Amino acid sequence: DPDTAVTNKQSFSTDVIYQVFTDRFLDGNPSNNPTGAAYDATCSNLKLYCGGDWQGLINKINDNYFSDLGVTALWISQPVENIFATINYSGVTNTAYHGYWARDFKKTNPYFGTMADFQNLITTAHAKGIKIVIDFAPNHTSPAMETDTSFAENGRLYDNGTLVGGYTNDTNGYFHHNGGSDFSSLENGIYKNLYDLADFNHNNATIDKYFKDAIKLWLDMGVDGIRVDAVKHMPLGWQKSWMSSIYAHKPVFTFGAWFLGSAASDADNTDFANKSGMSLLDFRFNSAVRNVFRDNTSNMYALDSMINSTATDYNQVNDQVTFIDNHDMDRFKTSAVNNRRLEQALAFTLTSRGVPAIYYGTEQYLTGNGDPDNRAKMPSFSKSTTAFNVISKLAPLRKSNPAIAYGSTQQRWINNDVYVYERKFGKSVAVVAVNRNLSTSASITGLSTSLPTGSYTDVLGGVLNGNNITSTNGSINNFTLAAGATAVWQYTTAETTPTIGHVGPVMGKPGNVVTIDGRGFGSTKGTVYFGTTAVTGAAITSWEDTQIKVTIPSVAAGNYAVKVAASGVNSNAYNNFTILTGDQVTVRFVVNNASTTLGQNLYLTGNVAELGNWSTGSTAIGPAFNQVIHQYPTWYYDVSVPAGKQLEFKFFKKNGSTITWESGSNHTFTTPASGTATVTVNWQ
Numbered sequence: 001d002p003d004t005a006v007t008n009k010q011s012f013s014t015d016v017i018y019q020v021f022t023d024r025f026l027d028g029n030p031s032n033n034p035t036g037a038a039y040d041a042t043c044s045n046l047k048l049y050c051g052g053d054w055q056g057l058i059n060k061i062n063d064n065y066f067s068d069l070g071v072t073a074l075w076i077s078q079p080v081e082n083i084f085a086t087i088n089y090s091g092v093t094n095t096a097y098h099g100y101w102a103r104d105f106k107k108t109n110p111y112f113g114t115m116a117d118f119q120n121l122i123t124t125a126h127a128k129g130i131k132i133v134i135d136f137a138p139n140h141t142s143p144a145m146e147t148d149t150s151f152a153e154n155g156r157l158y159d160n161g162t163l164v165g166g167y168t169n170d171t172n173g174y175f176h177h178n179g180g181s182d183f184s185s186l187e188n189g190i191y192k193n194l195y196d197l198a199d200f201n202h203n204n205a206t207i208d209k210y211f212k213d214a215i216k217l218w219l220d221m222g223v224d225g226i227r228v229d230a231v232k233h234m235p236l237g238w239q240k241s242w243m244s245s246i247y248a249h250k251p252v253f254t255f256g257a258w259f260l261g262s263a264a265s266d267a268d269n270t271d272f273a274n275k276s277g278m279s280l281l282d283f284r285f286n287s288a289v290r291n292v293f294r295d296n297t298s299n300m301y302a303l304d305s306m307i308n309s310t311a312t313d314y315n316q317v318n319d320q321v322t323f324i325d326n327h328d329m330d331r332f333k334t335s336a337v338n339n340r341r342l343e344q345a346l347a348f349t350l351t352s353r354g355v356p357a358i359y360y361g362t363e364q365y366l367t368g369n370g371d372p373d374n375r376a377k378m379p380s381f382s383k384s385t386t387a388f389n390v391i392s393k394l395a396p397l398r399k400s401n402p403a404i405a406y407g408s409t410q411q412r413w414i415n416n417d418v419y420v421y422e423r424k425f426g427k428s429v430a431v432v433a434v435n436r437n438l439s440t441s442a443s444i445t446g447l448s449t450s451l452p453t454g455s456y457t458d459v460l461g462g463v464l465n466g467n468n469i470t471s472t473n474g475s476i477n478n479f480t481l482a483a484g485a486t487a488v489w490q491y492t493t494a495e496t497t498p499t500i501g502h503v504g505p506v507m508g509k510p511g512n513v514v515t516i517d518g519r520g521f522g523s524t525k526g527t528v529y530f531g532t533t534a535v536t537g538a539a540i541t542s543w544e545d546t547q548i549k550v551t552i553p554s555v556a557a558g559n560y561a562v563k564v565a566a567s568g569v570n571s572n573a574y575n576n577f578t579i580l581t582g583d584q585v586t587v588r589f590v591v592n593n594a595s596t597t598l599g600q601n602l603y604l605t606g607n608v609a610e611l612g613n614w615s616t617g618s619t620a621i622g623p624a625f626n627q628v629i630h631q632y633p634t635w636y637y638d639v640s641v642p643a644g645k646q647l648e649f650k651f652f653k654k655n656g657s658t659i660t661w662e663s664g665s666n667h668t669f670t671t672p673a674s675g676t677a678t679v680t681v682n683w684q
């Protein structure tokens with residue numbers, strides 16, 4: 001199928017996601033509504049259930065609300081069964097309407113629908129070309145108190161009805177009993193409770209297996225993507241292992257939520273996006289956009305700076321999910337924020353790199369500050385707002401123009417209030433001009449672009465006061481950009497030479513099937529390169545002009561570049577593809593008596609690519625932890641490592657550029673065939 005079809009579960013670059021709180025959208029079936037105190041028919045007390053369900057989503061898909069809006073994917077609340085109990089937090093009654101208080105990841109939330117309703121949602125969605133993305137929260141169950149089992153449901157977990165265990169009397173150690181996190185460090189936030197939510201101990205073999213089994217269930221039902229909640233509060237190692245099991249079974253686009261407060265680069269965040277096997281919600285992009293269009297605390301330069309900085313930090317910037325707001329912050333729209341600014345932020349987001357997501361109601365200019373006010377009921381289904389118009393005209397461009405879906409970004413003109421950028425991919429180009437100044441127009445002179453000679457019409461049709469331009473070999477004739485204007489000019493044409501636009505997933509073991517999207521691959525089965533290794537014939541399960549499904553060859557584990565050769569012509573190289581040694585398992589490495597010097601950290605490396613292949617650089621594992629599970633001078637770290645393999649490893653201390661290794665022989669350990677394990681050694 002073409003890279004743009006609904007069947008492409010590995011790439012969302014050509015899509016526009018619509019994030020919706022299932023309970024706050026449409027109550028299509030009042031028969032499944034909760035009873036009593038947990039329900040509010042008027043939906044005025046936003047902490048209670050309002051009745052929204054999967055039937056309501058089905059209805060709006062059938063009457064073409066989403067089709068006319070232009071969205072091609074739906075991101076819904078966690079579908080799993082949540083606790084039924086009601087919780088009173090200092091006077092106010094709270095319910096699990098948000099879906100984050102799971103109790104059984106193998107059953108559906110009765111209030112949203114049955115297992116059958118869910119299947120019906122998938123079918124109905126796919127029939128109209130809409131992908132379904134689900135929220136999944138494997139970090140915890142629900143609120144719990146160890147001393148009081150009568151609080152909520154004591155964070156109890158069920159395996160399709162069968163009780164696995166609760167927070168109190170957790171003899172098996174399914175959860176962490178290290179208190180609540182104070183967010184003082186990364187380690188503190190991973191092994192301690194997120195508020196009062198019972199934290200899972202993924203090192204426990206049962207919990208590890210439970211989540212691999214539980215996710216397969218939903219993948220088997222046809223979900224096209226996964227939004228992993230609180231990725232910053234679970235070990236990267238376990239998550240990478242979990243991700244490889246997903247990719248070996250049914251690869252789907254997966255991204256996580258790692259909260260960031262500014263557009264500033266964050267080392268840990270960058271590492272996660274580059275090493276976990278999944279991408280992230282682009283909080284840096286979000287901050288810049290809000291600072292510039294909403295809050296007026298930054299100018300266009302901050303926007304351009306962020307575009308360049310993020311493109312440099314993330315290996316695959318096109319996999320990051322962008323947005324102007326969501327359930328974790330104030331609604332973009334405020335009384336002090338103009339409609340045009342909201343509209344410009346949307347246009348910018350929809351034409352920029354990454355995978356754009358729209359929080360439900362944005363098209364209706366919904367207001368609401370903080371939790372829960374920002375999760376109000378959908379006020380209307382009108383298709384007449386300007387914002388609705390902008391989305392319907394720009395969203396389709398991600399499918400029709402590869403420059404917008406896979407292209408690079410270059411600044412063509414800029415000043416405090418004006419920004420003109422260019423998206424380019426092969427011969428296809430897209431140019432967007434934005435003037436955030438609401439009162440004064442701007443005279444643009446000396447603008448150059450890659451647009452071929454010709455006359456260009458504003459894709460928006462002037463709804464955002466856009467204008468038409470004339471290109472003379474890229475040189476655009478002088479023009480006036482109206483106050484608060486924003487225009488989109490583009491040019492698309494067929495590509496003759498092979499060009500890779502996206503590869504998904506970007507991690508896997510030999511035998512897994514990866515998807516290569518792009519242009520000009522031709523219909524004749526060619527050859528795929530993973531470094532220097534050529535992959536041909538049967539190994540290439542599918543080959544079309546815009547997409548190539550290929551099997552990962554049995555080469556040495558490591559970092560590889562991917563190229564495609566069609567009719568003797570070599571395409572561009574898609575860098576940083578990770579090939580694993582084989583199936584993964586999470587192992588906790590513990591080392592005793594590793595006393596260090598001020599500012600000196602402990603790292604780990606060994607004889608497999610997953611351990612860095614004896615490297616002491618960015619591929620080495622670390623820095624190790626030393627506060628929560630084990631205390632200094634004992635260090636520890638959870639690492640995704642190959643299953644059933646004899647490993648050789650050593651720890652090393654690194655302060656500045658001085659590296660001091662362990663003496664003696666290398667430590668050895670044979671990893672288990674599956675699950676988890678703990679290996680403890682003494683510093684030599």
Ligand SMILES: OC[C@H]1O[C@H](S[C@H]2[C@H](O)[C@@H](O)[C@@H](O[C@H]3[C@H](O)[C@@H](O)[C@@H](S[C@H]4[C@H](O)[C@@H](O)[C@@H](O[C@H]5[C@H](O)[C@@H](O)[C@@H](S[C@H]6[C@H](O)[C@@H](O)[C@@H](O)O[C@@H]6CO)O[C@@H]5CO)O[C@@H]4CO)O[C@@H]3CO)O[C@@H]2CO)[C@H](O)[C@@H](O)[C@@H]1O
Binds near residue numbers: 098183195196230328
């Ligand atoms: O005693 C403390 C506290 O007790 C309760 S809080 C109570 C709340 O009243 C309920 O509404 C309910 O809240 C749940 C919420 O409704 C659900 O949607 C989820 S939220 C989920 C987030 O989506 C996810 O992002 C993450 O949380 C992240 C935050 O979103 C993000 O902003 C930051 S928090 C960061 C702040 O920005 C800073 O301002 C500063 O405070 O430092 C903070 C450091 O993190 O990062 C977070 C983690 O990445 O995870 C949450 C958890 O699911 O669940 C909510 C919790 O269930 O339930 C809570 C308690 O369970 C009292 O009501 C309150 O007054 C009191 O302060």
Ligand SMILES: [Ca+2]
Binds near residue numbers: 027029
């Ligand atoms: Ca209902």
Ligand SMILES: [Ca+2]
Binds near residue numbers: 200
């Ligand atoms: Ca945790």
